[PDB]
Design an enzyme around this catalytic site. Structure first.
Site, mmCIF file in Angstrom:
data_model
loop_
_atom_site.group_PDB
_atom_site.id
_atom_site.type_symbol
_atom_site.label_atom_id
_atom_site.label_comp_id
_atom_site.label_asym_id
_atom_site.label_seq_id
_atom_site.Cartn_x
_atom_site.Cartn_y
_atom_site.Cartn_z
ATOM 1 N N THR A 98 0.793 -1.221 0.080
ATOM 2 C CA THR A 98 -0.036 0.099 -0.183
ATOM 3 C C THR A 98 0.968 1.220 0.119
ATOM 4 O O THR A 98 1.678 1.423 0.782
ATOM 5 C CB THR A 98 -0.960 0.074 1.188
ATOM 6 O OG1 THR A 98 -1.728 -1.153 1.294
ATOM 7 C CG2 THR A 98 -1.922 1.065 1.045
ATOM 8 N N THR A 99 0.658 2.232 -1.005
ATOM 9 C CA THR A 99 1.356 3.342 -0.802
ATOM 10 C C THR A 99 0.417 4.490 -1.414
ATOM 11 O O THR A 99 -0.329 4.558 -2.615
ATOM 12 C CB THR A 99 2.452 3.302 -1.875
ATOM 13 O OG1 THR A 99 3.350 2.274 -1.681
ATOM 14 C CG2 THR A 99 3.220 4.676 -1.865
ATOM 15 N N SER B 117 3.041 1.112 3.383
ATOM 16 C CA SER B 117 4.094 0.037 3.703
ATOM 17 C C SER B 117 5.087 0.425 2.588
ATOM 18 O O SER B 117 6.348 0.516 3.013
ATOM 19 C CB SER B 117 3.914 -1.309 3.533
ATOM 20 O OG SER B 117 3.408 -1.373 2.121
ATOM 21 N N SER C 57 3.612 -5.337 -1.422
ATOM 22 C CA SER C 57 2.263 -4.776 -0.852
ATOM 23 C C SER C 57 1.838 -3.846 -1.903
ATOM 24 O O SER C 57 0.990 -2.864 -1.653
ATOM 25 C CB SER C 57 2.498 -4.282 0.448
ATOM 26 O OG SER C 57 2.695 -5.306 1.465
#
Lengths: 239, 152, 238, 240, 191, 230
Positions: free
Chosen positions: E1-2, E130, E169
């Site tokens: 996730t970004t 993350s 991720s």
């Protein structure tokens, strides 16, 4: 005759009960009259204002109240009981969106209002909020609607609507009005909504003495009319 | 206050023929905006009767000829619009329209020996429309009766 | 007379009679006089005997090291407000580690006595508290009333026939700011002797004098130490 | 009359007299007026000295609710003290839940609904107070509100609360308040007080003037009229 | 996730990946990581999925109710305060990475950052998630004061794609959003 | 009079305020219900005070489950309370037993709800009587509750105004065995006894029970049913 149940909310010998039906004449101390008209795919609220002072403002007088983005209302009766009734209406309109995930129908909201006014009649020890509420809204696959809630906990939706002091004179005009099969093309609605109130009150008001709320199939947002375009509809009926 | 509208009416009676009579109806809505004011004493009934006198006198000159339709269409113009003009909730029924047309039914008494029967009963059928509303109460209560006897 | 029953019921003249009757309980108690200088605030009360050989009922009672109060009215409402008074004084010592400002403690009393003057189920407090104290800005003399109003003042007398004491204070209030304790105390107890019937005298066994000072802790003197204060007095002009 | 005991009962014609009785208890209190200019709100209270032993600034009727909000109460003074602590407590929760100052339009709604709740039950009585609310901001300007004992709350340009409610607003409305500055207002408030019965059949009085607007940078405090004393110097010249 | 948020002169620019994973298995392949609250205020969420969806519903309930009473458009700082009052109160129970951004009529574009702790701070640009640790050296050597709108859409597209380069991720597809006074332009970028 | 209250007796007879609550039932809109051999027919009277009132907004015949319907004669505002009570109460049986609740079981429980407002004192009783229908286990049923809390099992009855004329009608009318189609014919013919002048497709509102479940009739059939069938 009376005596028997004219202090608290219990039954009368064979008849009904008086403390609830004393709230029906508790609207009339406002000294005001409101008219709602549904003719076709739009819906119109019209209500006069009464400003008795020059030191008194203009913006903090309006009885048109926006409940949600597509639901507006107007309040009659005494003033302080009217606004607390609106606070419950704004509150439970947001609980429907939170619990159920979509916009509340205008039909479902008057059930939730009149049931709160029902407990105050059934259970005692709270004054039953002597004010009246009229709603308008747009429903999918149903068109526009006009609803009225009562202090007794009664509600019924109906086309041409009067309230305040002059129900029996304005509704008598509107029964003879809505009997011919004329179409209602958004200015047939407004001009009858003006001239009914204009002849029953006998004011034929100057432009700065009223309010007009509207909703229409095209733009379903609740909309309060500008003072300039109120003059435009007033010069339209008197050509 | 409204003496400017009188001296402009002094201009238009000279310019009935020098200028065209539609411009008299173009100077007319300024005098209507004066009647739209009509506040307390300045531009109210007594001076409003003067513009009502001079607009009918211009209506006399314009429709003395067989082009009669201008005096009639000016009437359903203003007499439907006077509810928006002067005072709302039944204005006055007091010298704002009465003698302006009580002069005209006196003119219909004059023209009935001159004008033929067709445009005068077109004139009568257009003045019956507002005589059924008001203006035949008292004083000239027979503004209807001196012309409905003429229809007989 | 039907409006004269409850605290909730308003009158057609706009006056609640139950609050107006709790003022009358203050006039049942004896008189007491409080006053202050620039540096010293002294309140003097008057004891009343019950019988010929019982002890006299005390009026002035210690509260804190910089606050002492007098009393007039019901003894039931007296100790009930005292236990509320002492609890608030030691909470600021326990939390803030400072003594209370006197002006904001009395605002807690007006919030305390407001609820039983509006809600049904409890009578108003019949009480006549006079309050003397020291915040950081000098001495203070406060009074309260059962209508939950509190009045800052420089001299005050409440109780039985205390109007004659007020007349003495008004024509001598210009002298109070400068004089010290040797006469400031006996400026005060010259005001009590007009609240007496004209045949008996203020003795040593029926009077209490409490002094709190700028450099002096609140101290109650009674029945033994009043004799250095009652010396050097004239009699009544009879 | 008779059916006028509880606040939860109706008359045979449809009004509650217990609310009606508490309104004219505010009528017996002294006159407190309020007015706003184009960049501020100026308060003013006629306050009378009880006998002589008042100590020049006790039991005031110009409160201070928030950083920019104060009150101008009149009526039962003890009932207004408990009501002022509600507005102090209400504005604190708006700070702790939203992080900015309370708008005056939202503050008057929260107070008037609280006054409304004491007009419904038979256990409690309606309040006997009426008051003013004035504030100033840079995104909202100056506002001035008005709350009766029934709970009706909306905005004015000028008002009066007391005996001379009608007798003060007669000469308030002959002022050009839309363009004046609130330093010129202060010398004009003091003559409105001194015209109508300052000490005629009464004994004595003392004038209090509260003050909020652009010159205070949003702060609310009492006037520095003690400085230069100009209110009484300009109003006592209106003897003839 | 970004997740990504950059303000500019007009308003703000948002951006995120999708790839909702569990263990090493992608459960959701395309995901709306940014959520509307009001017409002008968005938030992009990170952390536990079930925690952030429950908070974003309650804030939309409270802020949406609050603006109808005032009859005014809400402030962006008002919305960021409501996330602080829940994340700080219900800490040791939630794992939320909320970044609040949006246009406001009083102040213009604003970007706030509420990490897993519960603090609140205004920033010029903000990262999170993350995969945000890998572009921290790129985002401050490339940022420049006084960008236009089209530069910021170019800025966050290259900035996300480096975190979305391979990191397990992150990746998937780029969802961008630009909030200004006129409207809200949302677009999906691939290839 | 002693009455004035609910928590005490009279020195001679019974509770008087419950008797006064039954007076509001008799001053309500008339209604009728007939139990036939294969189903139960409910029919009621519904006239607006004006031509403005939308008739298709608020309904009288109201379903509870897919095989149970219900009408009333009293005050509609008190009617909506115990309907919403009976809905949630009917679901509590189905969450426990996983079976649609029989019609004799609600009337045990709905009457116990109307029981509970006859207690305390600080409360008022209802002013609504009910008629409850349903076809459970082959045989259909037709019951009637009251504000006092008792209940019944009717063959045919009528509440509201002028019920004594409808009762002497049905005493002379109702036989044992007819179909549902003959039952509606004598259910409108008893509504015509005490109705007002015009009787259109919007003045009446009729629901039925089959063994195929509960159903209320749309005005297309009710216009075609009242079309010259007496």
């Amino acid at each position: 005759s009376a005596g028997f149940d004219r202090h608290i909310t219990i039954f009368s010998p064979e008849g009904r009960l008086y403390q609830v039906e004393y709230a029906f004449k508790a609207i009339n101390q406002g000294g005001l009259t409101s008219v709602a008209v549904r003719g076709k795919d739009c819906a119109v609220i019209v209500t006069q204002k009464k400003v008795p002072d020059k030191l008194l403002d203009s913006s903090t007088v309006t009885h048109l109240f926006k409940i949600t983005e597509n639901i507006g209302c107007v309040m009659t009766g005494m003033t302080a009981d009217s606004r607390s009734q609106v606070q419950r209406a704004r509150y439970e309109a947001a609980n429907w969106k939170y619990k159920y995930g979509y916009e509340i129908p205008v039909d479902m909201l008057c059930k939730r209002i009149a049931d709160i006014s029902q407990v105050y009649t059934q259970n005692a020890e709270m004054r039953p909020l002597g004010c009246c509420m009229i709603l308008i809204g747009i429903d999918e696959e149903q068109g526009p609607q006009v609803y009225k809630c009562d202090p007794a906990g009664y509600y019924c939706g109906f086309k041409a609507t009067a309230a305040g002091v002059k129900q029996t004179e304005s509704t008598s005009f509107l029964e003879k009005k809505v009997k011919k099969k004329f179409d209602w093309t958004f200015e047939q609605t407004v001009e009858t909504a003006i001239t009914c109130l204009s002849t029953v009150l006998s004011i034929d008001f100057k432009p700065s003495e009223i309010e007009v709320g509207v909703v229409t199939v095209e733009n379903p947002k609740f909309r309060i009319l500008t003072e300039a375009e109120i003059d435009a509809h007033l010069v339209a009926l008197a050509e | 206050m409204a003496d400017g509208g009188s001296e402009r009416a002094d201009g238009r009676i000279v310019k009935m023929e020098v200028d065209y009579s539609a411009t008299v109806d173009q100077r007319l809505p300024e005098c209507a905006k004066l009647a739209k004011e009509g506040r307390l004493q300045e531009v109210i009934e007594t001076l409003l009767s003067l513009e009502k006198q001079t607009r009918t006198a211009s209506d006399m000159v314009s429709t003395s000829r067989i082009l009669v339709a201008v005096v009639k269409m000016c009437y359903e113009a203003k007499e439907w619009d006077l509810l928006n003009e002067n005072i709302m909730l039944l204005s006055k029924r007091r010298s704002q329209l009465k003698q302006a047309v009580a002069k005209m039914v006196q003119q219909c008494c004059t023209y009935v020996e001159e004008i033929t029967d067709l445009p005068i009963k077109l004139r009568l059928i257009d003045t019956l429309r507002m005589v059924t509303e008001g203006k035949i109460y008292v004083e000239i209560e027979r503004a209807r009766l001196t012309k409905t006897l003429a229809t007989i | 007379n039907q409006y004269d029953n409850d605290v909730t019921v308003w009158s057609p003249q706009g006056r609640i009679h139950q609050i107006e009757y709790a003022m009358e309980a203050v006039k049942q108690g004896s008189a007491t006089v409080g006053l202050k200088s620039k540096t010293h605030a002294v309140l003097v009360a008057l004891k009343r005997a019950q019988s010929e050989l019982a002890a006299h009922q005390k009026k002035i009672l210690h509260v804190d090291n910089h606050i002492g109060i007098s009393i007039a009215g019901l003894t039931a409402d007296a100790r009930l407000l005292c236990n509320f008074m002492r609890q608030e004084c030691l909470d600021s010592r326990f939390v803030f580690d400072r003594p209370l400002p006197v002006s904001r403690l009395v605002s807690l009393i007006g919030s305390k006595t407001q609820i039983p003057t509006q809600r049904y189920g409890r009578r108003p407090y019949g009480v006549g508290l006079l309050i003397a104290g020291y915040d950081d800005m000098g001495p203070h003399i406060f009074q309260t009333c059962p209508s939950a109003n509190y009045f800052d003042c420089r001299a005050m007398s409440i109780g039985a026939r205390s109007q004659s004491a007020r007349t003495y204070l008004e024509r001598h209030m210009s002298e109070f700011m400068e004089c010290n304790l040797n006469e400031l105390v006996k400026h005060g107890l010259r005001a009590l002797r007009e609240t007496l019937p004209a045949e008996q005298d203020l003795t040593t066994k029926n009077v209490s004098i409490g002094i709190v000072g700028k450099d002096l802790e609140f101290t109650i003197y009674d029945d033994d130490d009043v004799s250095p204060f009652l010396e050097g007095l004239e009699e009544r002009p009879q | 009359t008779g059916y006028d005991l509880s606040a939860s009962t109706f008359s045979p014609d449809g009004r509650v007299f217990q609310v009606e009785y508490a309104m004219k208890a505010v009528e017996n209190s002294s006159t407190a007026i309020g007015i706003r200019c184009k960049d501020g709100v100026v308060f003013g209270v006629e306050k009378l000295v009880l006998s002589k032993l008042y100590e020049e600034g006790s039991n005031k009727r110009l409160f201070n609710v928030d950083r920019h909000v104060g009150m101008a109460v009149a009526g039962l003074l003890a009932d207004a003290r408990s009501l002022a602590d509600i507005a102090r407590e209400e504005a604190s929760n708006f700070r702790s839940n939203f992080g900015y100052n309370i708008p005056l339009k939202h503050l008057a709604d929260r107070v008037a609904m609280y006054v409304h709740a004491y007009t419904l039950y038979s256990a409690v009585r309606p309040f006997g107070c009426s008051f003013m609310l004035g504030s100033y901001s840079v995104n909202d300007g100056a506002q001035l509100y008005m709350i009766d004992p029934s709970g009706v709350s909306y905005g004015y340009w000028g008002c009066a609360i007391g005996k001379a409610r009608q007798a003060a607003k007669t000469e308030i409305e002959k002022l050009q308040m839309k363009e004046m500055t609130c330093r010129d207002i202060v010398k004009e408030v003091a003559k409105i007080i001194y015209i109508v019965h300052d000490e005629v059949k009464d004994k004595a009085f003392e004038l209090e003037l509260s003050w909020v607007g652009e010159l205070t940078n949003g702060r609310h405090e009492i006037v520095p009229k003690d400085i230069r004393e100009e209110a009484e110097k300009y109003a006592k010249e209106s003897l003839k | 996730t970004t997740i990504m948020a950059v303000q500019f002169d007009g308003g703000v620019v948002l951006g995120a990946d999708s790839r909702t994973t569990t263990g090493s298995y992608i459960a959701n392949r395309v995901t709306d990581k940014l959520t509307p609250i009001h017409d002008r205020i968005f938030c992009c969420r990170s952390g536990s999925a079930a925690d952030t969806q429950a908070v974003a519903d309650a804030v939309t309930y409270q802020l949406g109710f609050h603006s109808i009473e005032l009859n005014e458009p809400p402030l962006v700082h008002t919305a960021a305060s409501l996330f602080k009052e829940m994340c700080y109160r219900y800490r040791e129970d939630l794992m939320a990475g909320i970044i609040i951004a949006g246009w406001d009529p009083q102040e213009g574009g604003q970007v706030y950052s509420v990490p897993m702790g519960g603090m609140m701070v205004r920033q010029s640009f903000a990262i999170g998630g993350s995969g945000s640790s890998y572009i921290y050296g790129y985002v401050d050597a490339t940022y420049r004061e006084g960008m236009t709108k089209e530069e910021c859409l170019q800025f966050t597209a290259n900035a996300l794609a480096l975190a979305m380069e391979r990191d397990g991720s992150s990746g998937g597809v780029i969802r961008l959003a630009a909030i200004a006074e006129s409207g809200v332009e949302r677009q999906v970028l691939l290839g | 009079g002693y009455s004035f209250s609910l928590t005490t007796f009279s020195p001679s007879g019974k509770l008087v305020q419950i008797e006064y609550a039954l007076a509001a039932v008799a001053g309500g809109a008339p209604s009728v219900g007939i139990k036939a051999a294969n189903g139960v027919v409910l029919a009621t009277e519904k006239k607006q005070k004006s031509i403005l009132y939308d008739e298709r907004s608020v309904h009288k015949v109201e379903p509870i489950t897919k095989h149970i319907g219900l009408v009333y004669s009293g005050m509609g505002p008190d009617y909506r309370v115990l309907v919403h009570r009976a809905r949630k109460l009917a679901q509590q049986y189905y969450l426990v037993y996983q079976e649609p609740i029989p019609t004799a079981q609600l009337v045990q429980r709905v009457a116990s709800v109307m029981q509970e407002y006859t207690q305390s004192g600080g409360v008022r009783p209802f002013g609504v009587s009910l008629l409850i229908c349903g076809w459970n286990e082959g045989r259909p049923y037709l019951f009637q509750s009251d504000p006092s809390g008792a209940y019944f099992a009717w063959k045919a009855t009528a509440m509201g105004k002028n019920y004594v004329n409808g009762k002497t009608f049905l005493e002379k009318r109702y036989n044992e065995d007819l179909e549902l189609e003959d039952a509606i014919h004598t259910a409108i013919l008893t509504l015509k006894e005490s109705f007002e002048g015009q009787m259109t497709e919007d003045n009446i509102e009729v629901g039925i029970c089959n063994e195929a479940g509960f159903r209320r009739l749309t005005p297309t059939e009710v216009k075609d049913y009242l079309a010259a069938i007496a």
